[PDB]
Write a protein that binds this ligand. Structure first.
Ligand SMILES: [Ca+2]
Lengths: 223, 9
């Protein structure tokens, strides 16, 4: 997160860290056994870290659970990043508490201008690299589809939306992929891609979760 | 281009 703020310990209890000896992507807990992330975050040997704030210090509320299944969307395309969504099953159920809790799936799609909360442990610099120990937060609006497509001609599908700021300085960045965009208590977006971070006229692009609710529920029911 | 560690384009 570039241009964000320190969330505060366990203020985003659905935020998880995907770990392979280092943090490499985020995710969102949607029930005690399942995490929503981005398809491009797929890799073997994932450990899901819940209840984290400082991801380099043991603070007492962590739960480390290995991923037992990883299910990319059947029509994911790694070239276009269309359908950039993935479901991770935890080897064992997480213990739900005030610091480890799920986020609701949307019942309808969000409108342009809705304010959302974007969070993650990604790079905090638009030029160079600085990775934070503690979770970072950013309040950001959903942009109109017309502005999104003007920023990224030929690249925005009906399963994507832009959020953030065209003036630069505020964005998700490397390490935030797979994590949440939450609007009115609903998981509307997944951090996916963009041209750089926090660059002028290059807002962040996000997987449009409201298009996948049926698929998410069927996948959970059958795995 | 993606916001993973490492990024993919
Ligand atoms: Ca920790």
């Amino acid at each position: 997160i570039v241009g964000g703020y320190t969330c505060g310990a366990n203020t985003v209890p659905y935020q998880v860290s995907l770990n392979s000896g280092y943090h490499f992507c985020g995710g969102s807990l949607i029930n005690s056994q399942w995490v929503v992330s981005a398809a491009h975050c797929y890799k073997s040997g994932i450990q899901v870290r819940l209840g984290e704030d400082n991801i380099n210090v043991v603070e007492g509320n962590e739960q480390f659970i290995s991923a037992s299944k990883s299910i990319v969307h059947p029509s994911y395309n790694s070239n276009t990043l269309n359908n950039d969504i993935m479901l991770i099953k935890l080897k064992s159920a997480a213990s739900l508490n005030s610091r480890v809790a799920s986020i609701s799936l949307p019942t309808s799609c969000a409108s342009a201008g809705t304010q959302c909360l974007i969070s993650g442990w990604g790079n905090t610099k638009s030029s160079g690299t600085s990775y934070p120990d503690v979770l970072k937060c950013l309040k950001a609006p959903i942009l109109s589809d017309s502005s999104c497509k003007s920023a990224y001609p030929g690249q925005i599908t009906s399963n994507m939306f832009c959020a953030g700021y065209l003036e630069g300085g505020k964005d998700s960045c490397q390490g935030d992929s797979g994590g949440p965009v939450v609007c009115s208590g609903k998981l509307q977006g997944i951090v996916s891609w963009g041209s750089g971070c926090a660059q002028k006229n290059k807002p962040g692009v996000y997987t449009k979760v409201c298009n996948y609710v049926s698929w998410i529920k069927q996948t959970i029911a059958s795995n | 281009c993606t916001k993973s560690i490492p990024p993919q384009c």
